[PDB]
Amino acid sequence: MKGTIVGTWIKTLRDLYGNDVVDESLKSVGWEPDRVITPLEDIDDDEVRRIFAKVSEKTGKNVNEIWREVGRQNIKTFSEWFPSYFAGRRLVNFLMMMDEVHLQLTKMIKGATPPRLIAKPVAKDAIEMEYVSKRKMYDYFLGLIEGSSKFFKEEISVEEVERGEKDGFSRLKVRIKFKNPVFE
Numbered sequence: 357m358k359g360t361i362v363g364t365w366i367k368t369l370r371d372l373y374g375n376d377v378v379d380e381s382l383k384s385v386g387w388e389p390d391r392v393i394t395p396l397e398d399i400d401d402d403e404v405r406r407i408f409a410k411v412s413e414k415t416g417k418n419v420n421e422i423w424r425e426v427g428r429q430n431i432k433t434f435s436e437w438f439p440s441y442f443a444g445r446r447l448v449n450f451l452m453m454m455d456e457v458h459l460q461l462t463k464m465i466k467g468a469t470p471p472r473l474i475a476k477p478v479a480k481d482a483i484e485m486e487y488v489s490k491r492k493m494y495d496y497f498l499g500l501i502e503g504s505s506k507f508f509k510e511e512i513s514v515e516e517v518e519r520g521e522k523d524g525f526s527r528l529k530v531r532i533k534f535k536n537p538v539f540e
């Protein structure tokens with residue numbers, strides 16, 4: 357992972373569970389508890405994993421629900437730092453453009469690998485979206501979808517169609533249905 361997002365995860369976790377919990381968690385992996393992560397710094401993925409794990413044991417909160425809450429909260433942050441992505445759009449446009457964003461974000465650092473998020477209409481009021489990654493950040497993905505729905509103030513139902521590994525890649529396909537009719 358690259359530092360920019362990792363740092364974002366760390367701030368959010370503090371915002372949610374307090375500094376004590378975060379710092380000791382940060383200490384448990386051998387980081388300085390006040391570490392300053394640089395945008396293009398290479399942060400080991402497993403190190404993040406254990407930080408979240410440690411937070412889970414310190415709050416008694418299931419680690420997958422922590423990841424979902426981090427996701428929910430990240431949309432707000434993203435809207436503040438990249439408002440050009442949110443302005444003049446309805447939820448459906450945002451979600452469908454997300455794949456493009458990531459493909460054109462792989463430029464941020466040359467080593468960045470954010471997942472595919474290919475979306476496609478499957479009805480007048482529904483789209484499929486498929487998360488595809490070498491990682492398995494299923495709840496982070498689902499959290500971000502829910503947070504997008506809250507931000508745009510458009511209700512959705514999210515139905516999970518497929519989950520699991522398929523040739524080297526972890527995948528999660530959901531069917532996203534809009535209450536109000538979105539397409540013609």
Ligand code: MNH
Pocket residue numbers: 357358361434435438441454457458461464467468469470471473489490491492493496497500501504
């Ligand atoms: C603006 C909006 C926006 C931005 C700037 C954005 C940018 C990023 C960046 C940068 C990374 C880190 C990539 C890396 O390799 O270090 C990342 C990771 C990620 N992103 Mn997106 N992201 C979304 C919205 C955004 N994401 C939305 C919406 C979703 C889901 C619907 C999403 C799903 C993810 C997931 C899940 C990861 C975790 C990496 C992975 O799963 O492989 N996201």
